[PDB]
Amino acid sequence: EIKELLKLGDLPTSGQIRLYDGRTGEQFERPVTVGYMYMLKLNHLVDDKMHARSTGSYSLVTQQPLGGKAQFGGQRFGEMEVWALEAYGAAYTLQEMLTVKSDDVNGRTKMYKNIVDGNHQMEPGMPESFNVLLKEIRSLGINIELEDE
Amino acid sequence: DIVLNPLGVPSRMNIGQILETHLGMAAKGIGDKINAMLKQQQEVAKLREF
Amino acid sequence: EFDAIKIALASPDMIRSWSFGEVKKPETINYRTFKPERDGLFCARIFGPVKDYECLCGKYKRLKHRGVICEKCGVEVTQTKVRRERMGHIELASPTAHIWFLKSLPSRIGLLLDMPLRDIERVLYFESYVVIEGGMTNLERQQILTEEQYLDALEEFGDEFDAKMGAEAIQALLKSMDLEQECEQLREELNETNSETKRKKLTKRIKLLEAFVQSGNKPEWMILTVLPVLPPDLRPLVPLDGGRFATSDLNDLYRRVINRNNRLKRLLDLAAPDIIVRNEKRMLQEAVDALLDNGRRGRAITGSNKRPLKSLADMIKGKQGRFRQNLLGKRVDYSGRSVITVGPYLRLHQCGLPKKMALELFKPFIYGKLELRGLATTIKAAKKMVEREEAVVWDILDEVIREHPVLLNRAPTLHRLGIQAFEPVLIEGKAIQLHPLVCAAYNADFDGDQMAVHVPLTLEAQLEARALMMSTNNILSPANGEPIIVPSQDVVLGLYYMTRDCVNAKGEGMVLTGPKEAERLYRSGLASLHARVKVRITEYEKDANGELVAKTSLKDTTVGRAILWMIVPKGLPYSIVNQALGKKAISKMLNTCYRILGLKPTVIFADQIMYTGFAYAARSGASVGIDDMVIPEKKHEIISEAEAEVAEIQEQFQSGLVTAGERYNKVIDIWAAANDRVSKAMMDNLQTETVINRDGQEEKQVSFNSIYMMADSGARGSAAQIRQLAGMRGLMAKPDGSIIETPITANFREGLNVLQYFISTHGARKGLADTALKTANSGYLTRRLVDVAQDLVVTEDDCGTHEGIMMTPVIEGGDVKEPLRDRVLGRVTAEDVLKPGTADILVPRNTLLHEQWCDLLEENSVDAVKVRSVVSCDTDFGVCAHCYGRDLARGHIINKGEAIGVIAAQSIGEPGTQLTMRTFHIGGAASRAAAESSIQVKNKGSIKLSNVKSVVNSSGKLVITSRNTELKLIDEFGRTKESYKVPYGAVLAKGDGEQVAGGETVANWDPHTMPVITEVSGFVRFTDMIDGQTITRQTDELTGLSSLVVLDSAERTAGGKDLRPALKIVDAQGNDVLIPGTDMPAQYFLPGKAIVQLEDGVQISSGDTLARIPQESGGTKDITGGLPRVADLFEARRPKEPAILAEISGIVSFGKETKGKRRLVITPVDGSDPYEEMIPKWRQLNVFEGERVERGDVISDGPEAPHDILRLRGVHAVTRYIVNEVQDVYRLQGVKINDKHIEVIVRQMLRKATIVNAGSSDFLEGEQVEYSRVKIANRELEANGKVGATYSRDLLGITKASLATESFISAASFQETTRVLTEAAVAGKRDELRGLKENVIVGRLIPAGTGYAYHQDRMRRR
Amino acid sequence: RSPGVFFDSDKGKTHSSGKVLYNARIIPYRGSWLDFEFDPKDNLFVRID
Amino acid sequence: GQNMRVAFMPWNGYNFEDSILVSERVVQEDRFTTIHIQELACVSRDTKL
Amino acid sequence: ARVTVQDAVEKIGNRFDLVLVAARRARQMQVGGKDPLVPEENDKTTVIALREIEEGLINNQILDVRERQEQQE
RNA sequence: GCGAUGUGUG
DNA sequence: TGAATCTCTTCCAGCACACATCGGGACGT
DNA sequence: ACGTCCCGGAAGAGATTCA
């Protein structure tokens, strides 16, 4: 029935036309399929998906950057990404990725200033959320400490 | 007006969209034939026949 | 700053030293004002100030007053972070049991007092009594006493004889216990007793005690008296929109406990009545239990309406405790995210990145450069400028981008290619552009995926992103060696079209003078892109070092193929393009280019491939159209034959000659066969379709049908999908492991009536459901793997040993699947390989079999190499370099540091997940293949059987009565070419050692029945076969005859459960026919649900199927059934009927028969002969009273247990078992994984060991200690003149070898925290850093790469 | 699920012997459930909620 | 949605995986120019101070 | 200009010692003066470090030597 | 700027 | 009299987004 | 109203089968 309808029109039976390239103006080999397909837009738009964070707020209990776009949050360098970096040899990247870029407060203020002075260098310290883990395990009956060097 | 990608069809086994395309091309062919018969004014007996 | 972390119990003195004041008031704050209540929970004089250096009273608001206190409110004017650091305590009135140590299962308190946890709970919840320091009366010490018994006792015994109830009583028992003698008393009791159970109990109790004494702990510390309250900041009180504070779970729990404490304090100053003080103590106890760990007791409390509020054990445990939520995966600044799109104009080491994301990410660098140039003095001017986006910042931004890598990431990151680096290139728009040769690694189609960018800040980090993580530096997968920058779809189509040849196109057979004017002809349009042509091409070679012979000649080729030769770099030979260049061909093109010219030529050559491929693909314009899907005409015929066969099988099932499962399998198999025939018909029709004239008459060729090319080149899809588009679409699988017995018989080009479509719905919903749920499974798997295979890092350049596992080619029955070259490519030969000209040592015993040596081995036809392997590497704390063999993803040997643990665990667990989330878009098709019912040999050769125990049946053939019988085809040079599995009861055509030729069916059996063939000949009597109880007796209406069906456990009652239905061959005179050479009758046990078709008293010859067993084959064979087998392996679960193995070698004998067991006594030549073992005598032994066994040989059959494999045959045996099994799964699904990774998991599995004779060392005899430790110990003991320490290795599953670890932050991070923390606490287990996950938790370098160099420095300093 | 009675099987998994059980449930539209079930000792045991 | 003249063919890779390629004729004739409407609020509260 | 570090790895066999040596040299350039030993094409300090390595005129040995020399001075 | 539920993405 | 095997109870079940609503009532001044 | 309360898997421990 479609063949019969096309042939009612003045269009080729196969439904494939020869097309000419817009750039070089020379014919295509092997005729291609054209027609009118009914297409739809979808409310997943780039200007509602794109997002970027350099320095914004910080969560309140574990001094880490917030999460989400409404809140001006940064991404979640997650557990399997930590595995990927461990799988590479990269270790300084991971250190700054979960000490300076994220948590340690003295660390990241000093890092921000070192940057705005042109001196790229980190000074780690200790993850504040780890300090919190100590406080909780210590609030239970248990006693976790940090032995002398 | 839009270039899709052939290699997407026989993998994504939805052969339906290709027939949708052909049948749409038929529909628009009839549409342009009417458009010509209507631009060149054609003694509506002709429109009626077509 | 610090080092190893210690953990222990906490004395009340310890807690009082922590706290900075006492909490008394269960009232938080005002929320009319917002000052905090005095000495409540958010107090001020306890937990420091509220505002920076601003006392609460107001008298003091100046930095000058640092350190001083107030005198009116009395709050130390200091920073506010002090509110994060300080802690407070509660003075509980009556002591309180600590719910962890109570209910850790094992109950520390329990097996401390040795008192049943039931009774201890009854005491702790104030509904019983217990005597404490009894006295010289009728009663014991640990005796419990109910209400009534205590009533009666106080009636009779009103003496000093003392019993109490509750936490005070538990504390009294604890404190009045002396361990330093209990240890010796219990050890004496061990020396006394003999029962295994008593031994196990007393040894766990004696371990607890001796460790509890070694640590500086005291049993009266398990019982809280002073509960500490967490700081205020760590439990903040959130304001919602308004002046209202939504509920906070910690503050709720604390408030409850404080109210109970206060009310009970009030009762204990009024001499309150005993029932009320008892009820209130119980309430306080239950409240503290809720606080420590809600829900471990009975009905958990809830606060909002009906959801359990969150306690501290839940702040630590779970998928959302601090471990898996904020100490491993952290949210990160300097990040961003967007949607990806293509942009093929990129060199493959750079990625587009929208202007706005760039300007938002590099803001600090921009500030630096602005106030460095001087365009803005302060920082605020800079902030104004970059916000207003004045036109200087774009030049600034170019200069701060130019050479600065950024990390791109795709969300479900699986393998270490999930994060790569790129240099940025600023773009308009808002989408990250990505080079097309990298979607193969990210698994990123552009149907809407999102990628996240990170910026490396520090200078070392940029150098890492450039020298380890760049895109160019990863053009070989770390799983298999084959490339991972393989061109995917449009380009492979463009090439498969650009390098081919039709018979008579333009410019046929005219000579050309070089690739240049080949291109010039094609462009001017005087010759079709592909018509065969003789051209002078000049190919180079490097036959000597750095040499390049430039030999030139007249190849025969096709115009387009030469145009492609304009690109290929110098070294590669011209026979590399003269084929048609499918996807496999182009991949190995890149692979050879890599191996021969290093890196930079191959990168530039991959760019050239992509460019030219896209170009000539566009020029082709290979569109798909409806007409290009041709329906065959063998389809109708094949389908009609299939329906005739299902009709016949339906008739037979109507005649009852076959059971339900048997008819089901018959139907499904004929449909599979007809499916195969239809597919072959369509595929032939498509491929050779085009018959075109030559200037002769006519000639056929390979078609240019568009869908044929899209399926032949290897761009997308496969024969399965083009099958569903042209032939019938086969069968359909239920969401579980089932196949429907009504196959769709139509293809999409044809319509589908409603019913067929409905069945297709069954199939597709299988697809989706399995993706989701099996995804969950596989993810959990990879987690477990990378948490047992973590603490493993190449550390030495050479261990210096000589153990090595053996390597042979693997064959399945057709083509050799994974040949010796593929298995032993790149691995250090253990022991020099003799040329088979014996004593001509071909390769020395520490060479690295790279590709040249692999070719030598292939030429000289070696089929066994002994090669070094990680499982037997003798280095302490790691693996030496050589024993790990060739690294992958780089050519050269492994380095010193590259953390092979994690890369191995990922490459094993990855394709489980990746295939899972993809298993659907084949459709619902059924990957099912018949058993082939016969072994059709392929090539001239000889025959070799292994493990045959056959017998000659009546008709003169040879049936096989042995289980694992393995057939082999040898060639005419000695080489082993074929191996088959001949199932039980199969019929051999030729015996062993007989020359057969091709196409000579040697074996023939029935693929849906496990027969019960005999070995003797005589009459038959049913033994122990009572109707109704065990067997059932059906009757054929048609033939008037009957038949037996033997039932399993599911129906027999106690009337037959103690019976055994079995056939028994008698002779004509009613006597026991004995199997030749034996003394045991010829009895044959029938398994459950077995069909007996014969009659009684019948005469039968040797080798006749007395009984059939419907085989009950599984449904489908995709990766939704494989992966659980992988879990079973790496868990080391004991299978159902473990084939028992021969423990000690020597001759065998029987013993004294029990009711239903049977002794087996193996006597060696001379040694400790009395070894025995009981065998459940319903298990058919595979050895007879006279013959002899060697340790490791079987006695019965079936599955085979890895524990026993280990303790009998050897580590090499168990590792070869594990690797062959898991490779069987992943190859059946078609997945390349090199073996090193499975071997390193096996290593990390078997790492604990158990002592046998401490000798001169210091190990308890029945102790379990890690193998490396005992090895270094007895190694130095041997270095002195002493005796070693005999040990036996254990094989723990992974999810146990990760818990029983020396560290405990690792364990705590893995899969449960209650158990690990309580145990580590009571032992005081000091933990060093020593590994990767520990150092990551604590947040410092990782002794993996660059960190490994640093830790060299650090361990050197200390 | 419709308020009424249902005679369910729960075959296989339990008891690791293939002995099926047979639990009859009375599911009322508003109130307390009611369940009857056998044991591998062929004993008829009731439970409530 | 709206019906557009499509033609199936590879075209210089700009539709490598699935990436539809759209001619500027479409964006000129405003035949996907959708409209959104956001709702922004602003509350005023009298509190302490 | 720099795309691949393969020559740098060839002259420092580790591919991790590459990161360490290069970073140390780059700090020498960026923080404390010490002009490069190769005509910089406005490539950054990082690429300049890797480039000097490719010229085979920097490695851990030369760095230790020259640091010791200047520190004595 | 917390946690729940929910819908929806790759 | 002790060693199997049947019963019950704890513990885990992939990753990364995006957005929406909604957050406790019950009585003396 | 303000203020002030209320499911596979496994390992422990019955308990039942050998004597």
Ligand SMILES: Nc1ccn([C@@H]2O[C@H](COP(=O)(O)OP(=O)(O)OP(=O)(O)O)[C@@H](O)[C@H]2O)c(=O)n1
């Ligand atoms: N629970 C899920 C669902 C989807 N994905 C991601 O989604 C990808 C599959 O995308 P999808 O579009 O659903 O299937 P594709 O075949 O990749 O593309 P298409 O559906 O268009 O065929 C997977 O690789 C995976 O990365 C995932 O990780 N986890």
Ligand SMILES: [Mg+2]
């Ligand atoms: Mg997809």
Ligand SMILES: [Zn+2]
């Ligand atoms: Zn004050």
Ligand SMILES: [Zn+2]
């Ligand atoms: Zn070694």
